[PDB]
Structure formats: C-alpha cells, structure tokens
Design a binder for this molecule. Structure first.
Ligand SMILES: Nc1ncnc2c1ncn2[C@@H]1O[C@H](COP(=O)(O)OP(=O)(O)OP(=O)(O)O)[C@@H](O)[C@H]1O
Length: 327
C-alpha cells in the first residue's frame, strides 16, 4: 500500500494537548442571544451555509452571520472549536458569537465584518509591493494555525478578506479546517478545484499543513502572472493534467513512486508526457512588473508535487521575496 507521511513541522502539537483542545465532539457550545443581531442583507449561499450582513444592536457594529445548512450542521463543533482555538491569532477572523437561528433552527456563527474587495477586481490593481505585503500577511495566519495543530484546507482568494483601504487581511471560512494528527488518513475531497494539491488529486490521504502551501502557491502564481486561475482544470482529473503541463510528468511519476501511490488508470490516456517548464514561460509584457527572480524562486519552492519538499509557512516568511516588505 502507500508509504506513510508526516508533517516536518508541528508534528506532535495535538498529542501534547489535553483532549479538550482537539476532541471537538466533546465540546459544549456556549450560546449567545440571537436578538442581539439584526439581519440586513443576504451576502451569499453555498451548499453548507447562508451568509448575511447584520448589525449587532448592542454596539451598533457591523457583523457577518453564517447560518449553517443541515448538511454542515453535523460538523459544527469542529469549526467552532477551531475558531475558538485560533481566536486572537494573527489575521484569523474573529468569531464574535454563536447563536441559534430562530427560522432554520440551526447554529449561526457571528463573525467580525471586514470591508472586502472581490478578488476579480482587487487582484487587477495590486502592485508588486502589495502582492508581497499581502502574501506575508496570509503567511502569518497560516503559520499561526499550523503551529496550533490546524490545517485550513480551503485556502483560496474568496477565503482571504482584504480591506485594501486599511491594508488589513483576514483568513476566513474554517468550515473545512481540521486538526493534524500524525498518521491520520484524511478526506481528499477538500479545497476548491483550482487550489487542490497533487496529494488530493492522486488520492493520497496522509497529508498535512503543506496542502495549504500548495494552495498559497496557486494564489501567488495567479497574482504574479495575472492568470486566474493559474491551473485551470475542467474537473479534478484534468486539474492534475494542467499541473503536469507546467511541472512535468517525470517529477509527478517520481512523487507517486516515492509514496507508492498508484494513479487512477483513467490518467493513462490523458496525462501524456510533458517536460517541466521554466517559470519565465509565463512572463509577458503585461505581468513583467510583478515578476522578479525572488518571486519566481519563492513560487518554485511552493509549487512542488512532493508535499514534504514545499516550504513551510515559517520558511516562506524567511524568503528573499519578502526582504522589501516593511516589518
Ligand atoms: N467576515 C466577513 N466580512 C465580510 N464579508 C464576508 C465575511 N465572511 C464572508 N463574507 C462575504 O460573504 C459573501 C458570501 O460568502 P460565501 O462563502 O457564501 O461565498 P463566496 O465568498 O463567493 O465563496 P465560495 O467561493 O466558497 O463560493 C461573500 O461576498 C464573502 O466575501
């Protein structure tokens, strides 16, 4: 069968903890007052929740209320526990309350509001300096949650709220986050298609924090090359072919050989043979101002098939790409 794997950092953080920290099913939810919140407008709806802009009538502050659908209502304790564990951490969204919605009869999570700009408009305006600055801010959130024994598992532009006017960032939507336990086999049906790491695409279940670093590399490549998304798969199978057209098939086969993974035979007729492309292939007159030797080297060290080879969040923060960012 497959060769096992472990994180190279923060490996044993959860085993030292009292079970209270990570045994989310044993957690007793403290409920707030639903009447403190007045819903203002519906912001969105997904398969797992309905999201509303609301006002906290006790302090007249704007908040966001995520009312969980019955399908997400099952693993609510995991999201609550993770949000409470990470509360106050750098660039982590603050969970302000947990109330019972009177209409849905399901839990409603109340978060602080962030004045975000949709990435489809915002990413087009970012300068080279801004991409470095905001990437460093995301890394602070990722190193914090990883150091706390938690993988986000859904890093993508829609889950990074940026108040560009105030140069403030928050990492949101912890509904897919999970506690890392060495040797644990996890569900590969996590993250969004274009941000899924090769470990998920080849059905390797013993993954870790490094999944988030692949997703972050996908965001970086889209930002510096002005190509949204960078790996534009039509489905989860074509997603791996798109990756292989850039990183090459030889390193893909070495990755699966190292972990003794057997690729789904449906890849035999679609993967082909591709060499690794040099990152300069993606540079053109319209994105050249966002590209530097440091950006390319940093990206090259995130976008690796082997999850164990990728930079950790703390190693990423040490990279020369961030030397120009004021700290
Ligand atoms: N804390 C928050 N502050 C402000 N806006 C928020 C906050 N949390 C979520 N939102 C906004 O709520 C809206 C609906 O959220 P939702 O997750 O359902 O959709 P989405 O952002 O398009 O994500 P997805 O790509 O996963 O479908 C989005 O416009 C999102 O930016």
């Amino acid at each position: 069968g497959p060769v096992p794997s472990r994180a190279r950092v923060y490996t044993d953080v959860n085993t030292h903890r009292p079970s209270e920290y990570w045994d989310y099913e044993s957690h007793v939810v403290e409920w707030g007052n639903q009447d403190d919140y007045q819903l203002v407008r519906k912001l969105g709806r997904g398969k797992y929740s309905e999201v509303f802009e609301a006002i906290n009538i006790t302090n007249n502050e704007k908040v966001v209320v995520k009312i969980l659908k019955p399908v997400a209502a099952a693993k609510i304790k995991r999201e609550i526990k993770i949000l409470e564990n990470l509360r106050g951490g750098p660039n982590i969204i603050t969970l302000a309350d947990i109330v019972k919605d009177p209409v849905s009869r399901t839990p409603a999570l109340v978060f602080e509001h962030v004045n975000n700009t949709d990435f489809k408009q915002l990413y087009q305006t970012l300068t080279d300096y801004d991409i470095r600055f905001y990437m460093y801010e995301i890394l602070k959130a990722l190193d914090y949650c990883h150091s706390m024994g938690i993988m986000h598992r859904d890093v993508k532009p829609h889950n990074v709220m940026i108040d560009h006017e105030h140069r403030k960032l928050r990492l949101i939507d912890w509904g897919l986050a999970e506690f890392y336990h060495p040797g644990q086999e996890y569900n590969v049906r996590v993250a969004s298609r274009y941000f899924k790491g090769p470990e998920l695409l080849v059905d390797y279940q013993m993954y870790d924090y490094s999944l988030d670093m692949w997703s972050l590399g996908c965001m970086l490549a889209s930002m510096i090359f002005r190509k949204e998304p960078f790996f534009h798969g039509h489905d989860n199978y074509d997603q791996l072919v798109r990756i292989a057209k850039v990183l090459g098939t030889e390193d893909l086969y070495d990755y699966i050989d190292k972990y003794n993974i057997e690729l789904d035979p449906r890849f035999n007729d679609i993967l082909g043979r591709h060499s690794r492309k040099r990152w300069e292939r993606f540079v053109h007159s319209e994105n050249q101002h966002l590209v530097s030797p440091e950006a390319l080297d940093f990206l090259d060290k995130l976008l690796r098939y082997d999850h164990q080879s990728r930079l950790t969040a703390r190693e990423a923060m040490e990279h020369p790409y961030f030397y120009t960012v004021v700290k």
